[PDB]
Design a protein around this ligand. Structure first.
Ligand code: CLF
Ligand code: CLF
Ligand SMILES: [Ca+2]
Ligand SMILES: [Ca+2]
Lengths: 476, 522, 522, 476
């Protein structure tokens, strides 16, 4: 009930000191589907309170980790000490096709590897030496990007000049990116720093080139990172509907695809938070319109295929119907097999920006109810979009601390919890089935129709696995 | 399309013809990919000797490092103490990364907190975050002790940890009496091992420095054991078991084993076990302090020898037959307790396993990498097994250590083709396995990719990866293994002989081609 | 030709061109081999459903059995006793085979003797061989006890063991007092498990039958544990460790663990450890007798229930989470001792490993074979893991046992595609893996060949063999593993999840083909 | 010394009861190289004393295990209870090339699998049913053989009739073989039973067939079982010398090769004990001469190649010299690398019939001295051949008991011991390097020049392996 959820939020906040408690209450809200504006309900994207165990990453993770890293052709140098590159290597499954170390470099870790000499003297000379070295060793790379670690902003290193000078020397595009971890308050500013970086150094290269032939049906998937091959499953559906996909941002992406993006007629934006900055820019500079779409679950996909097709002519609209017709028996077969298995089961979700709101339809497509949801670093426009999707009196949390999350879960008692890797081991111990939302627990893809069968199957094996019955010892 | 009866995951779903056609169209249409012949020409080029020279010529670019930063080392050590919460002063993204790197390797929850310093915190300093952070963390997680380490942003701006922590107490944010050991841990200097060494000397120094007069050496009749940075539970367990078997009293400083291994019984335990504060305070009263991994325990050796006046014995990490014998004899001399019949039987068994598996193991060529103590221990053991370690690489190693290892290799007729490399990454190693080929590679999960590259050149050129080391992310529960002691030696011996036999079987499994050698009994 | 720097063994020596040319010439010139097309046509035929039917229709021919004879079972059991020499009455070729089969699996010496009955001994009887044999063996090997079993030649001619042994003592060949338990062990009847059961009831009966009046049940307050035929050392070790952990007093009857595991310390020990004669004599004084593998311990259950009046509890072999909980709770009820905190922690950890590895394990299909208790135990555990065991085969099993397993399968939604086959050999199983394909095969080294055949049909049709069971001859020291208890469950869980992950890596290792799914973190 | 060895033998025999002690002394001798006749020195091939742990196998092992099992095309049924076939399956490495289970069946275990119904009623009806079954399931097999286990002789089963009747029905050769374990006193009578079986049922089939074209250079390797590919390495040398090898007995053999054997000009006999019976028969029936040859070590091989070539014309003799010239630098290279390593090391060998005497030259080629040697089941003619090869005052034992062997080794103290699997684990424990002579410790081949490199390398790794230094604990 609303009074009960409100009491639960108040009850939990009692443990925190006053500055932290006062700030946190602004981040916890009982959801009202009716409210138009998020700010009345919840406040978000504010610096995290220290010592409370926030799940948030840094700006480097948002820029190097999510937008830039997935491009296959280019090489990304983590600039600074050895650790950031190391922890983040091959961490995220932005799937790609290529010959690694020869033409594609995604799983590879490239670093300046700062030592103290570099911190005292500075890293520019080294970055230039590293750029020259990168070039002799890996001759087929199509670009280079420098992702700034925290020490770069602090020691006064100018990477723009090195990037500009070397790029000119090598006739190669080098993108300096200032995603220092201290900048911003979450993985979020890094998306913006990364998006802006893409726009200043790589978007306008084929500004005057008219050689590529473009059909009126050309479209670019923006903000789909192909985790587990999500983009590929999403991509085949758009192609079957008759649209041509020129570019993917940035999963399994190539710099050539990105440079060819402005040529496209429409931009389909899957992840609003990460790449909306670039989408708005493209609409202002090139006039290309952008529409948010959802491919999780058969209902959102059908609704999404239908909306995208309307923006096009009747042949496309007709093709859209054939495809929905084609995969209808496949998806309903999945629903028939797994809905009886997952029906009425309550779900709690914590993820960073796009997914807490987005996977709701799929869960509901399986008869699961999402009791509560939250975001690691989402803005209020994200929250505006969220409440309509969330049911009434359901719990909403922004930048939930670890302590708050355990307490909410103990009270609420959800059947299944979808969250990241740090959160997962605590819950399994608690006996609550856990599915990792970020990595799709090494499964996927979860996008599209093909993705939905994997998703239903995954929720069902984890939720109903025999291991949950076995936790209390028989001898009391 | 998906048959509901047998659903396909990414693999082999993308192997379907509709998807294959789509990807090719995508590649041909928008990727502007280099021709396959060019990609092939370039790939064959990297496998060569000529490329290895340009690759080994690098002075500024590191590709695929075999080392991690200091705070990782600091957080793990802080985890060793009872009801202790690791706390890292500096930016938050580092903490998320440490928890995740640890979570994946241990498949267990890892508790860590940050004071969350921002851009604004960069100009002013880390003072507010430290007071609020210490106050918030204590109120929320109830840790008995909070151990501070720092992220590079903090190190570069220069926040004073000691001054910040004292002012926090002075201003009243946290009690005066609440333990708050702190260690500066610059990511640019060293590795996670050095990070581990700093956190430990700091914890040891905080508890024992002010009071030393009351302390008298050998008064408590226990031997302090300092594990160092360790990611195998079996190792903490084995050291304790043998000392226990021997009857020797001991104090394991920084024992993270209970917490990294708590049971799923329906209740989440943030804190489990750990080294007690009193154990740490009463430490100088031990007869002696033994350091398990001496190479990264240098700062702690200086504090223990100088302040506690313990004469730390020079002993190599207890790996292999000889080093284990040495560790036990030494404990026997310090404890005054004899080596029991039970332990001598175990050594007997290790030798019996060695005599039993010697023909398959003999002459095998290995390329291996890791932290310096572990690598050093493994190299010693392989030589004891008569195997040939061709390429030895320690990224975070040094000149003294390299000198120590060459000495070990010189002592054995086996270490003839062996070469030690330091400061060289996995990219360097990839080149080495291609130019001079080892039978096998012993290392962490990062080598899965080197193996992939070799198989690409050809079947015959592939070097299978054998996983011993840290981090291991593609296999489950290997962190429950033991590398120390006789038991550790037995586990390592079984994995190596079986890795070798497993490979022979794969090679002789072809029907009427190589199956003549696909023997039932080996 | 051989380069002295790198000498080549059979493989890949015969891979050389001169040899390849020679073999072909030999094949074309004198072998009169069927064309390769015909061989191919026939091979594809055996992979089919039509062939499976003809193959499953066999009533007289056994191909590749999964069972061995009785005396093997008898010699292993005799080895469990202190200073005891197994002695087999009958022909000698059998003893050579038992020692070799045991030597290869345990990679340890196996001591066994034969009275060496000949053709002439066949007409007269086994009386001389038994007197001389008993006299010679005792003088030469100094065994405290000699336990007699018999070879089929002896069983068919019908030598009376009891009469022969008594006349040997009566005539003065060996002392009257010297222990000589004997058990008839017909190779045509049963298997090695039955052979093990017979030897044991005989040893138990010889020591305890004459004196029962003095014995009173529960007087000694220890619980008798009868292992059954067991080839994993960790099993003997784990059962003892847990009882020890719980504080329960116990007597393990027939413990062959010290002898099968003696150290190479320069001296050869023919006899090590073993169950004492006094332990055997004072056995009826136990509170109760628990049989670890009940399916092959039926004769012993009859002697223990009838003669000693112990009410043997009905418990399944302690494999898996549920069965081990049941064994411990039962020991707790008989002992009166509580299950300690330490053991409950271990169970928690097993569950944590289960929750941690469930996604990879779920839905996996397995074809497995072995002795009935072990197979039964494994089937129960896989279902607890949510894996799907498709084909279950026990060669030496029976109708009651099959009924028991089907019930187990019926209890779990997971046992739906599962089918139990008894009296069917590995040739039958080969057909089953080809017609209905399991992801994996769990079995002994004999399955190396089934795997080879599947790979022959295709890469995609290959079923990798995971070895758990007996005999294992192509891998080293696996006999040191544990399958019983939580520890055994943990070992089994790690091997299965890692076997599955190892396979996924192989399948996704192709460059720019399947490497998209060749993930660093799994 | 001679007095010391003689004392050692007397000293050991003291433990045994009198009938056993009296009999055993006849089997232990101090070698005199001078003696022409073995019987003066030692007695052999007598029933083993019970309870003394003799290493001898049964007649089934000699017939099924050694002569018959290696033929690739034919199927061998172990007739009787399940154990004999099972213990012996894939135990011995008689290497062969074929598609197993389809056209070649060596590693496969085929059994009648007697149960009590069979022991009471008898197994003839079953054997016939098994023969019919064997035929439908494995259509490409070229023959069938029935190896009698111990119960066959005892229960009165007539396998000759079933073999004769089915063979006639299937127009297939079925060879009944009576290698019952109780018959004979060692693996030896089995060879004879097997040899005689081959001669009555398979040798004379192409008695009247003259279609196969035969050169004067045709030869058959008799008694080489290709353990580890020994025959193949031996075969390539004869082929290079210019001789044509029609047949191999019986390693990697085929029934077609055996039937074509009598067509050959000369029979080279490697193993005298196992197949001398067939060789003599061939000389009496077909007039084909047989010569014993040794391929272990460069000296025996050169001496052997030379002798075989003399029996032929000058072209062959000339070719023999080219080959010795060709492999001379290869073998001497091996000698140069490994002799300094193995020089002066004393060796003790126990093996069954051909090898104790035969591998002596190879060990000496490496500078190793064989202090003592013995035989599991060798006849006296075998012993006549042995003393010339053995040095003076060296220990000789026939059917050595386990106890005798350990005591002899403790006193003599050889550096390395070559013996079988049962003997190996005891010795390693004792700290003495052990090499298995029967299976070549899963290595080989040890025959020929190519085989010699493997052999020198194998003695060197085991003898000088670092593990032997490590046995006594440092703490005394
Ligand atoms: S916020 Fe990198 S792990 Fe950290 S202490 Fe620095 S070297 Fe080490 Fe962000 S940019 Fe990176 S991820 Fe952190 S580190 Fe800064
Ligand atoms: S002398 Fe008899 S022929 Fe020889 S090898 Fe022995 S068995 Fe066989 Fe034995 S193992 Fe058992 S008891 Fe029989 S059935 Fe087979
Ligand atoms: Ca865990
Ligand atoms: Ca052994």
């Amino acid at each position: 009930s609303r009074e009960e959820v409100e009491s639960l939020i108040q009850e939990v906040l009692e443990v925190y000191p006053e500055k932290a408690r006062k700030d946190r209450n602004k981040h916890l809200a009982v959801n009202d589907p009716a409210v138009t504006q998020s700010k009345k309900c919840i406040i978000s994207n504010k610096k995290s309170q220290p010592g409370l165990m926030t799940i948030r990453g840094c700006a480097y993770a948002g820029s190097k980790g999510v937008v830039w890293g997935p491009i296959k052709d280019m090489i990304h140098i983590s600039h600074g000490p050895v650790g950031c590159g190391q922890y983040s290597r091959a961490g995220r499954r932005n799937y790609y096709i290529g010959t690694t170390g020869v033409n594609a470099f995604v799983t590879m870790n490239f670093t300046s590897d700062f030592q103290e000499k570099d911190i005292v003297f500075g890293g520019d000379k080294k970055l230039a030496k590293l750029i020259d070295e990168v070039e002799t060793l890996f001759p087929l790379n199509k670009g280079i990007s420098v992702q700034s670690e925290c020490p770069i902003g602090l020691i006064g290193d100018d990477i723009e000049s090195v990037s500009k000078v070397k790029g000119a020397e090598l006739s190669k595009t080098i993108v300096p990116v200032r995603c220092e971890g201290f900048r911003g308050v979450s993985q979020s500013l890094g998306h913006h720093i990364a998006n802006d970086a893409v726009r200043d150094w790589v978007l306008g290269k084929r500004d005057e080139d008219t050689t590529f032939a473009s059909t009126p049906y050309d479209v670019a998937i923006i903000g789909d990172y192909n985790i587990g091959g999500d983009a590929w499953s999403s991509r085949i559906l758009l192609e079957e509907m008759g649209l041509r996909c020129v570019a993917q941002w940035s999963g399994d992406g190539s710099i050539s695809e990105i440079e060819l993006t402005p040529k496209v007629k429409l931009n389909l934006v899957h992840c609003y938070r990460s790449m909306n900055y670039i989408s708005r820019h493209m609409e202002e500079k090139y006039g290309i319109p952008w529409m948010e779409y959802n491919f999780f679950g058969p209902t959102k996909t059908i609704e999404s295929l239908r909306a995208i097709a309307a923006k096009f002519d009747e042949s496309i609209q007709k093709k859209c119907e054939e495809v929905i017709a084609k995969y209808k028996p496949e998806w309903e077969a999945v629903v028939a097999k797994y809905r009886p298995r997952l029906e009425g089961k309550r779900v709690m979700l914590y993820i960073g920006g796009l997914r807490p709101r987005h996977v709701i339809g799929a869960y509901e497509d399986l008869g699961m109810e999402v009791v509560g949801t939250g975001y690691e670093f989402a803005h209020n426009d994200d929250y505006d979009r969220t409440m309509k999707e969330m049911g009434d009196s359901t719990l909403l949390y922004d930048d939930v601390t670890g302590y708050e999350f355990e307490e909410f879960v103990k009270r609420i008692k959800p059947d299944l919890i979808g969250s990241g890797i740090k959160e997962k081991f605590i819950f399994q111990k608690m006996g609550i089935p856990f599915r990792e939302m970020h990595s799709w627990d090494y499964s996927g893809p979860y996008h599209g129709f093909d993705g939905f069968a994997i998703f239903a199957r995954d929720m069902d094996m984890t939720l109903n696995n025999p291991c949950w019955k076995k936790l209390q010892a028989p001898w009391e | 399309s998906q048959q509901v009866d047998k659903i396909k995951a990414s693999y082999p779903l993308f192997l379907d013809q509709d998807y294959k056609d789509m990807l090719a169209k995508k590649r041909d249409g928008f990727e502007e990919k280099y021709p396959q012949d060019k990609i092939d020409e370039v790939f064959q080029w990297t496998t060569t000797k000529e490329y290895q020279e340009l690759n080994f010529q690098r002075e500024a670019l590191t590709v695929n490092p075999a080392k991690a930063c200091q705070p990782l080392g600091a957080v793990l050590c802080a985890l060793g103490f009872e009801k202790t919460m690791p706390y890292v002063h500096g930016s938050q993204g580092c903490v998320a990364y440490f928890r995740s790197y640890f979570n994946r390797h241990f498949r267990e929850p890892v508790s860590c907190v940050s004071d969350s310093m921002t851009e604004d915190a960069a100009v002013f300093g880390g003072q507010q975050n430290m007071k609020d952070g210490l106050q918030n963390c204590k109120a929320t997680y109830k840790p008995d002790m909070i151990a501070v380490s720092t992220t590079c942003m903090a190190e570069v701006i220069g926040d004073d940890l000691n001054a910040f922590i004292n002012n926090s107490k002075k201003e009243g944010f946290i009690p005066d009496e609440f333990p708050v050991p702190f260690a500066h841990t610059p990511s640019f200097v060293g590795s996670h091992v050095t990070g581990w060494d700093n956190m430990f000397e700091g914890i040891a120094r905080y508890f024992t420095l002010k009071s030393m007069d009351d302390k008298v050496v050998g008064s408590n009749k226990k031997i302090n054991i300092v594990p160092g940075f360790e990611t195998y539970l079996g190792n903490f367990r084995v050291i304790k078991r043998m000392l226990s078997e021997m009857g020797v009293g001991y104090s394991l400083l920084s024992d993270p084993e209970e917490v990294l291994d708590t049971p799923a019984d329906g209740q989440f335990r943030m804190y489990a076990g750990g080294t007690t504060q009193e154990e740490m305070k009463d430490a100088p009263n031990a007869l002696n302090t033994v350091l398990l991994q001496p190479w990264h325990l240098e700062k702690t050796k200086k504090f223990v020898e100088g302040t506690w006046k313990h004469e730390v014995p020079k002993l190599n990490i207890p790996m292999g037959l000889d080093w284990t014998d040495e560790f036990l004899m030494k404990v026997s001399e310090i404890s005054g307790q004899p080596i029991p019949a039970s332990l001598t039987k175990e050594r007997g068994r290790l030798v019996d396993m060695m005599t039993d598996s010697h023909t398959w193991l003999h002459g095998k060529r290995f390329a291996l990498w890791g932290d310096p103590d572990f690598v050093m221990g493994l190299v010693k053991f392989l030589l004891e097994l008569g195997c040939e370690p061709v390429h030895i690489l320690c990224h975070n190693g040094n000149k003294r250590w390299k000198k120590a290892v060459d000495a070990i290799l010189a002592a054995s007729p086996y270490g003839k083709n062996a070469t030690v490399y330091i400061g060289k990454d996995l990219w360097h190693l990839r080149s080495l396995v291609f130019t001079d080929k080892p039978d096998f590679m012993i290392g962490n999960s990062y080598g899965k990719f080197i193996q992939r590259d070799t198989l690409h050149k050809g079947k015959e050129f592939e070097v299978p990866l054998i996983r011993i080391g840290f981090p291991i992310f593609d296999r489950h529960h290997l962190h429950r293994s033991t590398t120390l002691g006789y038991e550790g030696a037995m586990q390592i011996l079984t994995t190596l002989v079986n890795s070798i036999l497993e490979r022979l079987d794969e090679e002789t499994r072809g029907m009427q081609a190589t199956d003549y050698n696909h023997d039932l009994v080996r």
